[PDB]
Design a binder for this molecule. Structure first.
Ligand code: 915
Ligand code: ZN
Length: 514
Protein backbone atom coordinates (compact mmCIF):
# COMPACT_ATOMS: atom_id res chain seq x y z
CA UNK A 1 0.00 0.00 0.00
CA UNK A 2 1.94 2.98 -1.40
CA UNK A 3 5.23 1.67 -2.86
CA UNK A 4 7.32 3.87 -0.61
CA UNK A 5 5.17 2.91 2.33
CA UNK A 6 5.51 -0.81 1.69
CA UNK A 7 9.29 -0.28 1.50
CA UNK A 8 9.43 1.66 4.78
CA UNK A 9 7.32 -0.89 6.64
CA UNK A 10 9.44 -3.86 5.57
CA UNK A 11 12.62 -2.00 6.35
CA UNK A 12 11.37 -1.16 9.89
CA UNK A 13 10.36 -4.80 10.54
CA UNK A 14 14.00 -5.68 9.81
CA UNK A 15 15.67 -2.57 11.24
CA UNK A 16 16.97 -4.14 14.50
CA UNK A 17 18.20 -7.17 12.48
CA UNK A 18 20.14 -4.82 10.10
CA UNK A 19 21.61 -2.86 13.01
CA UNK A 20 22.85 -6.10 14.59
CA UNK A 21 24.67 -7.32 11.47
CA UNK A 22 28.43 -7.52 12.04
CA UNK A 23 30.88 -6.12 9.54
CA UNK A 24 31.45 -9.82 8.78
CA UNK A 25 27.76 -10.77 8.18
CA UNK A 26 27.47 -7.57 6.19
CA UNK A 27 30.46 -8.47 3.95
CA UNK A 28 29.00 -11.95 3.51
CA UNK A 29 25.67 -10.65 2.13
CA UNK A 30 27.60 -8.33 -0.21
CA UNK A 31 29.72 -11.26 -1.46
CA UNK A 32 26.45 -13.18 -1.98
CA UNK A 33 25.03 -10.31 -4.04
CA UNK A 34 28.26 -9.57 -5.90
CA UNK A 35 30.34 -12.63 -6.64
CA UNK A 36 34.11 -12.42 -6.74
CA UNK A 37 35.19 -12.54 -10.39
CA UNK A 38 38.48 -13.96 -11.61
CA UNK A 39 41.07 -11.30 -12.55
CA UNK A 40 41.82 -11.64 -16.28
CA UNK A 41 45.40 -10.44 -15.64
CA UNK A 42 46.16 -13.08 -13.11
CA UNK A 43 44.83 -15.73 -15.45
CA UNK A 44 46.85 -14.70 -18.53
CA UNK A 45 49.98 -14.18 -16.40
CA UNK A 46 49.73 -17.79 -15.21
CA UNK A 47 49.87 -19.16 -18.74
CA UNK A 48 53.06 -20.09 -20.61
CA UNK A 49 53.86 -18.68 -24.08
CA UNK A 50 52.57 -21.74 -25.89
CA UNK A 51 49.31 -21.73 -23.90
CA UNK A 52 48.86 -18.05 -24.63
CA UNK A 53 49.28 -18.83 -28.36
CA UNK A 54 46.86 -21.70 -28.04
CA UNK A 55 44.29 -19.66 -26.16
CA UNK A 56 44.82 -17.00 -28.84
CA UNK A 57 43.85 -19.16 -31.82
CA UNK A 58 41.43 -21.67 -30.31
CA UNK A 59 37.79 -21.75 -31.49
CA UNK A 60 36.24 -21.07 -28.07
CA UNK A 61 32.65 -21.49 -29.34
CA UNK A 62 33.55 -24.99 -30.57
CA UNK A 63 33.71 -26.39 -26.99
CA UNK A 64 30.58 -28.34 -25.96
CA UNK A 65 31.39 -28.34 -22.24
CA UNK A 66 31.42 -24.60 -21.43
CA UNK A 67 28.66 -22.26 -20.33
CA UNK A 68 28.04 -19.03 -22.20
CA UNK A 69 29.51 -17.00 -19.37
CA UNK A 70 32.69 -19.18 -19.37
CA UNK A 71 32.83 -19.00 -23.17
CA UNK A 72 32.49 -15.21 -22.98
CA UNK A 73 35.05 -14.59 -20.22
CA UNK A 74 37.44 -16.77 -22.16
CA UNK A 75 36.77 -14.66 -25.32
CA UNK A 76 37.77 -11.48 -23.46
CA UNK A 77 40.97 -13.28 -22.45
CA UNK A 78 41.42 -14.06 -26.13
CA UNK A 79 41.10 -10.36 -27.04
CA UNK A 80 43.48 -9.22 -24.35
CA UNK A 81 45.94 -11.85 -25.56
CA UNK A 82 45.83 -10.35 -29.03
CA UNK A 83 45.14 -6.78 -27.82
CA UNK A 84 48.60 -6.01 -29.22
CA UNK A 85 48.33 -7.42 -32.74
CA UNK A 86 47.71 -5.55 -36.01
CA UNK A 87 44.15 -4.64 -36.89
CA UNK A 88 44.48 -6.80 -39.96
CA UNK A 89 45.77 -9.69 -37.79
CA UNK A 90 42.77 -9.25 -35.47
CA UNK A 91 40.24 -8.95 -38.29
CA UNK A 92 41.82 -11.88 -40.10
CA UNK A 93 42.39 -13.94 -36.94
CA UNK A 94 38.62 -13.88 -36.30
CA UNK A 95 37.15 -13.58 -39.80
CA UNK A 96 37.38 -17.35 -40.42
CA UNK A 97 35.20 -18.42 -37.50
CA UNK A 98 32.31 -17.74 -39.95
CA UNK A 99 32.80 -21.01 -41.88
CA UNK A 100 34.43 -22.32 -38.70
CA UNK A 101 33.39 -25.56 -37.16
CA UNK A 102 36.07 -27.90 -36.08
CA UNK A 103 35.28 -30.06 -33.09
CA UNK A 104 38.41 -29.13 -31.18
CA UNK A 105 41.64 -31.05 -31.25
CA UNK A 106 42.14 -33.41 -28.35
CA UNK A 107 44.98 -31.16 -27.19
CA UNK A 108 42.62 -28.17 -27.28
CA UNK A 109 39.90 -29.77 -25.20
CA UNK A 110 42.39 -30.95 -22.59
CA UNK A 111 43.78 -27.41 -22.24
CA UNK A 112 40.30 -25.87 -21.95
CA UNK A 113 39.11 -28.59 -19.62
CA UNK A 114 41.83 -27.50 -17.16
CA UNK A 115 41.50 -23.76 -17.78
CA UNK A 116 37.83 -24.01 -16.86
CA UNK A 117 38.86 -24.72 -13.27
CA UNK A 118 40.83 -21.48 -13.05
CA UNK A 119 38.14 -19.13 -14.42
CA UNK A 120 35.32 -19.79 -11.98
CA UNK A 121 34.01 -16.90 -9.91
CA UNK A 122 33.32 -17.32 -6.19
CA UNK A 123 29.53 -17.42 -6.45
CA UNK A 124 27.50 -18.79 -3.49
CA UNK A 125 24.15 -18.53 -5.21
CA UNK A 126 25.47 -20.33 -8.31
CA UNK A 127 27.10 -23.10 -6.26
CA UNK A 128 23.76 -23.75 -4.56
CA UNK A 129 21.82 -23.64 -7.84
CA UNK A 130 24.36 -25.85 -9.74
CA UNK A 131 24.33 -28.51 -6.94
CA UNK A 132 20.63 -28.15 -6.03
CA UNK A 133 21.88 -27.56 -2.43
CA UNK A 134 24.03 -30.73 -2.47
CA UNK A 135 27.11 -28.75 -1.58
CA UNK A 136 29.34 -31.73 -0.72
CA UNK A 137 29.28 -32.92 -4.36
CA UNK A 138 32.92 -33.27 -5.42
CA UNK A 139 32.55 -30.96 -8.41
CA UNK A 140 35.02 -28.37 -7.15
CA UNK A 141 38.29 -27.99 -5.22
CA UNK A 142 37.93 -29.32 -1.66
CA UNK A 143 39.23 -26.10 -0.11
CA UNK A 144 36.74 -23.95 -2.04
CA UNK A 145 34.03 -26.56 -1.41
CA UNK A 146 34.56 -25.96 2.37
CA UNK A 147 34.52 -22.15 2.12
CA UNK A 148 31.18 -22.31 0.31
CA UNK A 149 29.87 -24.59 3.06
CA UNK A 150 30.94 -22.14 5.78
CA UNK A 151 29.52 -19.06 3.98
CA UNK A 152 26.25 -20.88 3.38
CA UNK A 153 26.01 -22.04 7.01
CA UNK A 154 26.85 -18.50 8.08
CA UNK A 155 24.15 -17.00 5.83
CA UNK A 156 21.51 -19.54 6.94
CA UNK A 157 22.17 -18.39 10.55
CA UNK A 158 21.81 -14.67 9.66
CA UNK A 159 18.44 -15.26 7.94
CA UNK A 160 16.57 -16.12 11.10
CA UNK A 161 13.86 -13.48 11.15
CA UNK A 162 10.50 -14.39 9.64
CA UNK A 163 8.39 -12.00 7.60
CA UNK A 164 5.60 -12.35 10.14
CA UNK A 165 1.89 -13.16 10.32
CA UNK A 166 1.12 -9.44 9.87
CA UNK A 167 3.03 -8.80 6.62
CA UNK A 168 2.95 -12.08 4.63
CA UNK A 169 -0.55 -11.59 3.16
CA UNK A 170 -0.25 -7.81 3.06
CA UNK A 171 2.65 -7.64 0.55
CA UNK A 172 3.73 -9.13 -2.75
CA UNK A 173 7.43 -9.49 -3.48
CA UNK A 174 8.83 -9.39 -7.00
CA UNK A 175 11.42 -11.00 -9.18
CA UNK A 176 12.46 -10.33 -12.76
CA UNK A 177 13.81 -13.30 -14.60
CA UNK A 178 15.33 -14.20 -17.94
CA UNK A 179 13.38 -17.05 -19.52
CA UNK A 180 16.68 -18.58 -20.56
CA UNK A 181 17.28 -19.17 -16.85
CA UNK A 182 14.62 -21.92 -16.84
CA UNK A 183 14.41 -23.09 -20.45
CA UNK A 184 17.23 -22.17 -22.88
CA UNK A 185 15.14 -24.16 -25.38
CA UNK A 186 11.70 -22.39 -25.25
CA UNK A 187 13.63 -19.23 -24.36
CA UNK A 188 15.13 -18.70 -27.85
CA UNK A 189 11.66 -19.04 -29.45
CA UNK A 190 9.09 -17.91 -26.87
CA UNK A 191 9.31 -14.27 -27.81
CA UNK A 192 7.32 -13.83 -31.02
CA UNK A 193 9.75 -14.43 -33.88
CA UNK A 194 8.11 -11.60 -35.84
CA UNK A 195 7.06 -9.01 -33.27
CA UNK A 196 9.51 -9.20 -30.39
CA UNK A 197 7.12 -7.15 -28.20
CA UNK A 198 4.82 -10.17 -28.13
CA UNK A 199 4.70 -13.70 -26.71
CA UNK A 200 4.08 -16.78 -28.88
CA UNK A 201 0.70 -18.13 -27.59
CA UNK A 202 1.58 -21.68 -28.64
CA UNK A 203 4.74 -21.94 -26.56
CA UNK A 204 3.32 -19.95 -23.60
CA UNK A 205 0.64 -22.64 -23.32
CA UNK A 206 3.51 -25.16 -23.39
CA UNK A 207 5.55 -23.41 -20.68
CA UNK A 208 2.45 -22.76 -18.58
CA UNK A 209 0.84 -26.17 -19.06
CA UNK A 210 3.38 -27.97 -16.94
CA UNK A 211 4.46 -25.14 -14.61
CA UNK A 212 2.86 -26.13 -11.29
CA UNK A 213 5.71 -25.87 -8.75
CA UNK A 214 9.20 -24.52 -8.34
CA UNK A 215 12.02 -24.78 -5.87
CA UNK A 216 14.70 -22.36 -4.81
CA UNK A 217 17.85 -24.14 -3.64
CA UNK A 218 19.58 -20.82 -3.47
CA UNK A 219 18.76 -17.50 -1.86
CA UNK A 220 16.21 -15.62 -3.92
CA UNK A 221 16.89 -11.86 -3.99
CA UNK A 222 13.48 -10.22 -4.46
CA UNK A 223 12.31 -6.62 -4.97
CA UNK A 224 9.91 -5.16 -2.40
CA UNK A 225 8.44 -3.15 -5.31
CA UNK A 226 8.17 -4.37 -8.87
CA UNK A 227 11.01 -3.19 -11.09
CA UNK A 228 10.73 -2.43 -14.80
CA UNK A 229 12.06 -5.29 -16.86
CA UNK A 230 15.49 -4.84 -18.32
CA UNK A 231 16.77 -6.47 -21.46
CA UNK A 232 16.01 -10.19 -21.41
CA UNK A 233 13.61 -9.98 -18.45
CA UNK A 234 10.36 -11.31 -19.87
CA UNK A 235 9.31 -13.08 -16.67
CA UNK A 236 7.82 -11.01 -13.89
CA UNK A 237 7.25 -13.03 -10.72
CA UNK A 238 4.80 -11.82 -8.08
CA UNK A 239 5.49 -13.81 -4.95
CA UNK A 240 3.56 -14.23 -1.72
CA UNK A 241 5.55 -15.40 1.29
CA UNK A 242 4.38 -17.66 4.07
CA UNK A 243 4.10 -16.16 7.55
CA UNK A 244 7.20 -18.17 8.53
CA UNK A 245 9.47 -17.55 5.52
CA UNK A 246 12.80 -16.18 6.83
CA UNK A 247 14.39 -13.21 5.08
CA UNK A 248 16.76 -10.29 5.64
CA UNK A 249 16.42 -6.67 4.47
CA UNK A 250 18.84 -5.55 1.75
CA UNK A 251 19.52 -1.88 1.01
CA UNK A 252 17.68 -0.42 -1.92
CA UNK A 253 14.39 -2.09 -1.18
CA UNK A 254 15.15 -5.77 -1.53
CA UNK A 255 14.81 -8.88 0.53
CA UNK A 256 17.03 -11.92 0.58
CA UNK A 257 14.97 -15.01 1.34
CA UNK A 258 16.12 -18.23 3.02
CA UNK A 259 17.31 -21.03 0.68
CA UNK A 260 15.38 -24.35 0.16
CA UNK A 261 11.89 -22.97 -0.10
CA UNK A 262 9.04 -24.39 -2.17
CA UNK A 263 6.79 -22.40 -4.49
CA UNK A 264 3.34 -23.18 -5.84
CA UNK A 265 2.56 -21.70 -9.24
CA UNK A 266 -0.91 -20.22 -8.69
CA UNK A 267 -1.40 -18.37 -11.96
CA UNK A 268 0.59 -17.61 -15.13
CA UNK A 269 -0.80 -15.05 -17.60
CA UNK A 270 0.44 -12.89 -20.44
CA UNK A 271 0.28 -9.24 -19.45
CA UNK A 272 1.21 -5.88 -20.93
CA UNK A 273 3.70 -3.43 -19.50
CA UNK A 274 4.93 -0.27 -21.23
CA UNK A 275 3.76 -1.54 -24.63
CA UNK A 276 5.67 -4.86 -24.39
CA UNK A 277 4.30 -8.27 -23.49
CA UNK A 278 5.65 -10.01 -20.39
CA UNK A 279 4.84 -13.24 -18.61
CA UNK A 280 3.46 -12.80 -15.12
CA UNK A 281 4.14 -15.57 -12.65
CA UNK A 282 2.06 -15.58 -9.46
CA UNK A 283 3.62 -17.88 -6.88
CA UNK A 284 3.06 -18.70 -3.24
CA UNK A 285 5.69 -19.86 -0.84
CA UNK A 286 5.05 -23.33 0.62
CA UNK A 287 7.28 -25.86 2.40
CA UNK A 288 9.82 -27.45 0.08
CA UNK A 289 8.90 -30.84 1.56
CA UNK A 290 5.34 -30.52 0.19
CA UNK A 291 6.88 -30.14 -3.32
CA UNK A 292 9.58 -32.77 -2.80
CA UNK A 293 6.64 -35.07 -1.97
CA UNK A 294 4.92 -34.41 -5.31
CA UNK A 295 8.25 -35.18 -7.00
CA UNK A 296 8.93 -38.44 -5.18
CA UNK A 297 5.37 -39.56 -5.98
CA UNK A 298 5.87 -38.66 -9.68
CA UNK A 299 9.11 -40.63 -9.62
CA UNK A 300 7.41 -43.77 -8.25
CA UNK A 301 4.58 -43.50 -10.73
CA UNK A 302 6.84 -43.12 -13.79
CA UNK A 303 8.89 -46.16 -12.78
CA UNK A 304 5.85 -48.33 -12.08
CA UNK A 305 4.35 -47.15 -15.36
CA UNK A 306 7.55 -48.11 -17.29
CA UNK A 307 8.56 -51.19 -15.31
CA UNK A 308 5.26 -52.65 -16.60
CA UNK A 309 5.60 -51.46 -20.22
CA UNK A 310 9.24 -52.67 -20.38
CA UNK A 311 8.44 -55.82 -18.44
CA UNK A 312 10.81 -55.35 -15.50
CA UNK A 313 10.24 -56.16 -11.82
CA UNK A 314 7.89 -53.50 -10.40
CA UNK A 315 10.30 -52.17 -7.74
CA UNK A 316 13.00 -51.49 -10.36
CA UNK A 317 14.53 -48.03 -9.92
CA UNK A 318 15.13 -47.05 -13.56
CA UNK A 319 14.10 -43.41 -13.63
CA UNK A 320 15.43 -40.70 -11.28
CA UNK A 321 14.13 -37.09 -11.07
CA UNK A 322 17.07 -35.20 -9.62
CA UNK A 323 15.18 -31.93 -9.30
CA UNK A 324 16.03 -28.90 -7.19
CA UNK A 325 15.54 -25.69 -9.16
CA UNK A 326 12.99 -23.12 -10.30
CA UNK A 327 11.57 -24.99 -13.27
CA UNK A 328 10.97 -28.19 -11.25
CA UNK A 329 7.51 -29.28 -12.40
CA UNK A 330 8.63 -28.95 -16.04
CA UNK A 331 11.52 -31.37 -15.51
CA UNK A 332 9.11 -33.92 -14.11
CA UNK A 333 6.51 -33.33 -16.85
CA UNK A 334 9.24 -33.31 -19.55
CA UNK A 335 10.43 -36.84 -18.59
CA UNK A 336 7.00 -38.27 -19.45
CA UNK A 337 7.00 -36.68 -22.91
CA UNK A 338 10.54 -37.76 -23.66
CA UNK A 339 10.08 -41.41 -22.72
CA UNK A 340 6.92 -41.43 -24.86
CA UNK A 341 8.71 -40.03 -27.88
CA UNK A 342 11.46 -42.57 -27.23
CA UNK A 343 8.92 -45.43 -27.24
CA UNK A 344 6.98 -44.08 -30.23
CA UNK A 345 10.18 -43.86 -32.28
CA UNK A 346 12.32 -46.90 -31.57
CA UNK A 347 11.59 -50.59 -32.05
CA UNK A 348 10.21 -52.03 -28.85
CA UNK A 349 12.75 -54.85 -28.90
CA UNK A 350 15.68 -52.44 -29.11
CA UNK A 351 14.30 -50.56 -26.10
CA UNK A 352 13.80 -53.69 -24.00
CA UNK A 353 17.14 -55.29 -24.79
CA UNK A 354 19.26 -52.18 -24.25
CA UNK A 355 17.21 -50.99 -21.22
CA UNK A 356 17.71 -54.46 -19.69
CA UNK A 357 21.42 -54.26 -20.26
CA UNK A 358 21.45 -50.91 -18.40
CA UNK A 359 19.31 -52.33 -15.62
CA UNK A 360 21.83 -55.21 -15.17
CA UNK A 361 24.51 -52.63 -14.40
CA UNK A 362 22.13 -50.75 -12.07
CA UNK A 363 21.88 -48.00 -14.69
CA UNK A 364 19.52 -45.08 -14.53
CA UNK A 365 17.82 -42.48 -16.73
CA UNK A 366 18.46 -39.25 -14.78
CA UNK A 367 16.27 -36.24 -15.57
CA UNK A 368 17.69 -33.21 -13.71
CA UNK A 369 17.94 -29.45 -13.27
CA UNK A 370 21.35 -29.51 -11.52
CA UNK A 371 24.64 -29.56 -13.41
CA UNK A 372 25.89 -32.91 -14.66
CA UNK A 373 29.13 -32.96 -12.54
CA UNK A 374 26.84 -33.04 -9.52
CA UNK A 375 25.04 -36.26 -10.60
CA UNK A 376 26.63 -39.22 -8.78
CA UNK A 377 26.08 -41.42 -11.86
CA UNK A 378 28.83 -39.28 -13.42
CA UNK A 379 30.92 -38.09 -10.47
CA UNK A 380 31.37 -41.45 -8.75
CA UNK A 381 33.21 -42.61 -11.89
CA UNK A 382 35.12 -39.37 -12.55
CA UNK A 383 37.52 -38.35 -9.76
CA UNK A 384 39.34 -35.70 -11.81
CA UNK A 385 37.20 -32.53 -11.68
CA UNK A 386 38.72 -31.47 -15.04
CA UNK A 387 37.20 -34.52 -16.77
CA UNK A 388 33.79 -33.92 -15.29
CA UNK A 389 31.37 -32.48 -17.82
CA UNK A 390 28.21 -30.39 -17.77
CA UNK A 391 26.16 -30.47 -20.98
CA UNK A 392 22.64 -31.16 -22.27
CA UNK A 393 23.11 -34.90 -22.16
CA UNK A 394 25.54 -37.64 -21.18
CA UNK A 395 25.84 -41.43 -21.33
CA UNK A 396 28.13 -42.88 -18.63
CA UNK A 397 29.27 -46.41 -19.55
CA UNK A 398 30.71 -47.12 -16.05
CA UNK A 399 27.30 -46.61 -14.60
CA UNK A 400 25.12 -47.46 -17.58
CA UNK A 401 23.16 -44.25 -17.19
CA UNK A 402 21.69 -41.54 -19.26
CA UNK A 403 21.83 -38.06 -17.76
CA UNK A 404 19.62 -35.42 -19.33
CA UNK A 405 19.76 -31.82 -18.12
CA UNK A 406 16.52 -29.87 -18.65
CA UNK A 407 17.41 -26.14 -18.70
CA UNK A 408 20.33 -26.17 -21.12
CA UNK A 409 20.38 -26.21 -24.90
CA UNK A 410 21.92 -29.01 -26.93
CA UNK A 411 23.73 -28.58 -30.25
CA UNK A 412 21.15 -28.28 -33.05
CA UNK A 413 18.38 -30.12 -31.25
CA UNK A 414 14.67 -29.32 -31.61
CA UNK A 415 13.78 -30.68 -28.19
CA UNK A 416 14.90 -32.83 -25.23
CA UNK A 417 13.40 -36.00 -26.75
CA UNK A 418 16.03 -35.79 -29.45
CA UNK A 419 18.83 -35.37 -26.91
CA UNK A 420 17.53 -38.46 -25.19
CA UNK A 421 17.46 -40.57 -28.37
CA UNK A 422 21.05 -39.50 -29.07
CA UNK A 423 22.03 -40.58 -25.54
CA UNK A 424 20.27 -43.91 -26.09
CA UNK A 425 22.44 -44.25 -29.25
CA UNK A 426 25.42 -44.25 -26.91
CA UNK A 427 23.83 -47.02 -24.86
CA UNK A 428 23.15 -49.04 -28.05
CA UNK A 429 26.84 -48.58 -28.97
CA UNK A 430 27.84 -49.90 -25.53
CA UNK A 431 25.52 -52.99 -25.60
CA UNK A 432 26.43 -54.03 -29.16
CA UNK A 433 30.16 -53.95 -28.44
CA UNK A 434 29.38 -55.93 -25.31
CA UNK A 435 27.38 -58.58 -27.11
CA UNK A 436 30.37 -59.18 -29.42
CA UNK A 437 32.70 -59.61 -26.45
CA UNK A 438 31.40 -60.24 -22.95
CA UNK A 439 34.90 -61.22 -21.79
CA UNK A 440 36.38 -57.89 -22.81
CA UNK A 441 33.62 -55.32 -23.14
CA UNK A 442 34.37 -52.39 -25.47
CA UNK A 443 32.21 -49.97 -27.52
CA UNK A 444 31.11 -51.03 -30.99
CA UNK A 445 32.36 -47.72 -32.40
CA UNK A 446 35.83 -48.72 -31.28
CA UNK A 447 35.62 -51.58 -33.85
CA UNK A 448 38.09 -51.30 -36.77
CA UNK A 449 35.10 -51.54 -39.10
CA UNK A 450 33.25 -48.49 -37.71
CA UNK A 451 36.47 -46.55 -37.35
CA UNK A 452 37.11 -46.85 -41.10
CA UNK A 453 33.48 -46.01 -41.83
CA UNK A 454 33.89 -42.90 -39.67
CA UNK A 455 37.08 -41.80 -41.44
CA UNK A 456 35.00 -41.95 -44.64
CA UNK A 457 31.43 -40.85 -43.74
CA UNK A 458 32.21 -39.14 -40.44
CA UNK A 459 31.54 -35.66 -41.87
CA UNK A 460 28.49 -36.39 -43.95
CA UNK A 461 25.88 -35.72 -41.25
CA UNK A 462 25.59 -33.08 -38.48
CA UNK A 463 28.59 -30.90 -37.72
CA UNK A 464 28.44 -32.36 -34.19
CA UNK A 465 28.66 -35.80 -35.85
CA UNK A 466 32.32 -35.08 -36.69
CA UNK A 467 33.55 -34.80 -33.06
CA UNK A 468 34.54 -38.46 -32.93
CA UNK A 469 33.36 -41.97 -33.81
CA UNK A 470 31.17 -42.32 -30.71
CA UNK A 471 29.24 -39.10 -31.37
CA UNK A 472 28.97 -39.74 -35.09
CA UNK A 473 27.25 -43.10 -34.36
CA UNK A 474 25.00 -41.44 -31.75
CA UNK A 475 24.02 -38.61 -34.16
CA UNK A 476 23.29 -40.98 -37.06
CA UNK A 477 21.32 -43.16 -34.61
CA UNK A 478 19.33 -40.10 -33.53
CA UNK A 479 18.63 -38.92 -37.07
CA UNK A 480 17.62 -42.43 -38.19
CA UNK A 481 14.90 -42.14 -35.55
CA UNK A 482 13.78 -38.54 -36.03
CA UNK A 483 10.07 -37.80 -36.33
CA UNK A 484 10.85 -36.15 -39.69
CA UNK A 485 11.33 -38.66 -42.52
CA UNK A 486 13.69 -36.39 -44.51
CA UNK A 487 16.22 -36.81 -41.71
CA UNK A 488 15.91 -40.59 -41.70
CA UNK A 489 16.54 -40.60 -45.49
CA UNK A 490 19.61 -38.30 -45.50
CA UNK A 491 21.36 -40.73 -43.19
CA UNK A 492 20.66 -43.71 -45.45
CA UNK A 493 21.47 -41.46 -48.41
CA UNK A 494 24.48 -39.43 -47.20
CA UNK A 495 25.84 -42.17 -44.93
CA UNK A 496 24.91 -45.64 -46.22
CA UNK A 497 27.87 -47.44 -44.70
CA UNK A 498 26.86 -46.01 -41.27
CA UNK A 499 23.11 -46.63 -41.76
CA UNK A 500 23.75 -50.28 -42.64
CA UNK A 501 26.28 -50.62 -39.84
CA UNK A 502 23.74 -49.42 -37.26
CA UNK A 503 20.82 -51.46 -38.61
CA UNK A 504 23.16 -54.40 -38.44
CA UNK A 505 23.99 -53.60 -34.81
CA UNK A 506 20.24 -53.21 -34.04
CA UNK A 507 19.51 -56.59 -35.71
CA UNK A 508 22.32 -58.25 -33.72
CA UNK A 509 20.94 -56.91 -30.40
CA UNK A 510 17.38 -58.02 -31.22
CA UNK A 511 18.49 -61.54 -32.28
CA UNK A 512 20.80 -62.33 -29.33
CA UNK A 513 19.49 -64.77 -26.68
CA UNK A 514 18.55 -64.06 -23.04
C1 915 B 1 23.79 -33.36 -30.64
C2 915 B 1 23.79 -33.60 -29.16
C3 915 B 1 24.70 -32.91 -28.31
C4 915 B 1 24.64 -33.12 -26.90
S1 915 B 1 25.71 -32.20 -25.84
O1 915 B 1 25.80 -30.84 -26.33
O2 915 B 1 25.41 -32.50 -24.48
N1 915 B 1 27.30 -32.90 -25.96
C5 915 B 1 27.64 -34.03 -25.09
C6 915 B 1 27.14 -35.38 -25.64
O3 915 B 1 27.29 -35.75 -26.77
N2 915 B 1 26.52 -36.17 -24.71
O4 915 B 1 26.06 -37.42 -25.10
C7 915 B 1 29.15 -34.21 -24.84
C8 915 B 1 29.90 -33.01 -24.17
C9 915 B 1 31.39 -33.24 -23.93
O5 915 B 1 31.57 -34.43 -23.18
C10 915 B 1 31.03 -35.62 -23.78
C11 915 B 1 29.52 -35.47 -24.02
C12 915 B 1 23.71 -34.03 -26.32
C13 915 B 1 22.82 -34.73 -27.13
C14 915 B 1 22.86 -34.48 -28.55
F1 915 B 1 21.97 -35.11 -29.32
ZN1 ZN C 1 26.89 -37.80 -27.36
Amino acid sequence: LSRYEKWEKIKQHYQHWSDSLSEEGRGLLKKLQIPIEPKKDDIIHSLSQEEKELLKRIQIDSSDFLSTEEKEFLKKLQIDIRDSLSEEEKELLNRIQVDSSNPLSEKEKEFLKKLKLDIQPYDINQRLQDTGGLIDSPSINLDVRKQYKRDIQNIDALLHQSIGSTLYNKIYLYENMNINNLTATLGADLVDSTDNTKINRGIFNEFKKNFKYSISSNYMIVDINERPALDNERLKWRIQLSPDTRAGYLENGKLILQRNIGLEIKDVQIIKQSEKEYIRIDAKVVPKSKIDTKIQEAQLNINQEWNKALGLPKYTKLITFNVHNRYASNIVESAYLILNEWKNNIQSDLIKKVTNYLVDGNGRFVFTDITLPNIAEQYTHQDEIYEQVHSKGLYVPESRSILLHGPSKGVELRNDSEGFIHEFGHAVDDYAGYLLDKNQSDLVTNSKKFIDIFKEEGSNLTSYGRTNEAEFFAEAFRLMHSTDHAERLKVQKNAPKTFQFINDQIKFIINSLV
